[PDB]
């Protein structure tokens, strides 16, 4: 299937608290593999996956220097944006970028990214044509014109279609065996009291990876897509994820309900019911 190399980059200004904090994080197929943080004792791009450890010293030097250059650009961007939005020099502000490429099974580029946000809102983004820009407001129109006047889309296009794709291929070769990790959910139902003649049945899915999962409750063939409570999928902290979905049912009718768990690691979706303790 498809793959992606994306860098998620942030600077946060701290007037009277020092220089802006700059963090740059790389992802292969949505998995963090590199990180740079300006607040580290000695700021360097670091491996965040073991398969990256085989990249030699010159790789780390070059990319550390690139990050330091991007840090400078972001520092400048922040001062510039302060003027564009006529904001006071004393406030804290954030700039964020998502940059990179998505490639299909056949190695062709599906999508190239270059999106900017100022203070958590869209600023400017490269269009799917890889030639033009969408500016979110008046201020971003200044940048749109500047980058048109610099041919920025062409320099960016060469990176996206060339450099990004080539490096993604290399990273995938080194990381395939690790990135392919799949952990199927292990599921169970818990039983909890509700006022009067009702009980809560909670279907748990634990230990799974990737995080993508669906949990459903059925009463006699019908999916209860109205009264089911569910939590956002959440990290266990150990590389695996957790989710639950619960339903309120009549006391004594617990065996009339079934939970189903859908995951990519499951050949057949799981079916389970409340079982009272052994």
């Amino acid at each position: 299937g498809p793959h992606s190399l994306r860098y998620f980059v942030t600077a946060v200004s701290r007037p009277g608290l020092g220089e802006p904090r700059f963090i740059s994080v790389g992802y292969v197929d949505n998995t963090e593999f590199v990180r740079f943080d300006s607040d580290a004792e000695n700021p360097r791009y670091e491996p965040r996956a073991r398969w990256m450890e085989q990249e030699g010293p010159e790789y780390w030097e070059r990319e550390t220097q690139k990050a330091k250059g991007n840090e400078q650009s972001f520092r400048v961007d922040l001062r510039t944006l302060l003027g564009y939005y006529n904001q006071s020099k004393g406030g804290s502000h954030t700039i964020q970028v998502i940059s990179g490429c998505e490639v299909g099974s056949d190695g062709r580029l599906l999508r190239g990214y270059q999106q900017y946000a100022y203070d958590g809102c869209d600023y400017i983004a490269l269009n799917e044509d890889l030639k033009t820009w969408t500016a979110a407001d008046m201020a971003a129109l200044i940048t749109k014109h500047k980058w048109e006047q610099a041919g920025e889309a062409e320099r960016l296009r060469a990176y996206l279609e060339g450099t990004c794709v080539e490096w993604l291929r290399r990273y995938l070769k080194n990381g395939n065996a690790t990135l392919l990790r799949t952990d199927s959910p292990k599921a169970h139902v818990t039983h909890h009291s509700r006022p009067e003649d009702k009980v809560t049945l909670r279907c748990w899915a634990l230990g799974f990876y990737p995080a993508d999962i669906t949990l459903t409750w059925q009463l006699n063939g019908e999916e209860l897509i109205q009264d089911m409570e569910l939590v956002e999928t959440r990290p266990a902290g150990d590389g695996t994820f957790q989710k639950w979905a619960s339903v309120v049912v009549p006391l004594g009718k617990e065996q009339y309900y079934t939970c189903h768990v859908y995951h990519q690691g499951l050949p057949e979706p799981l079916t389970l019911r409340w079982e009272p303790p052994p």
Partner: peptide
């Protein structure tokens, strides 16, 4: 590897 960003 990342892109060398321009300034806004």
């Amino acid at each position: 590897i990342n892109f060398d960003f321009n300034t806004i």
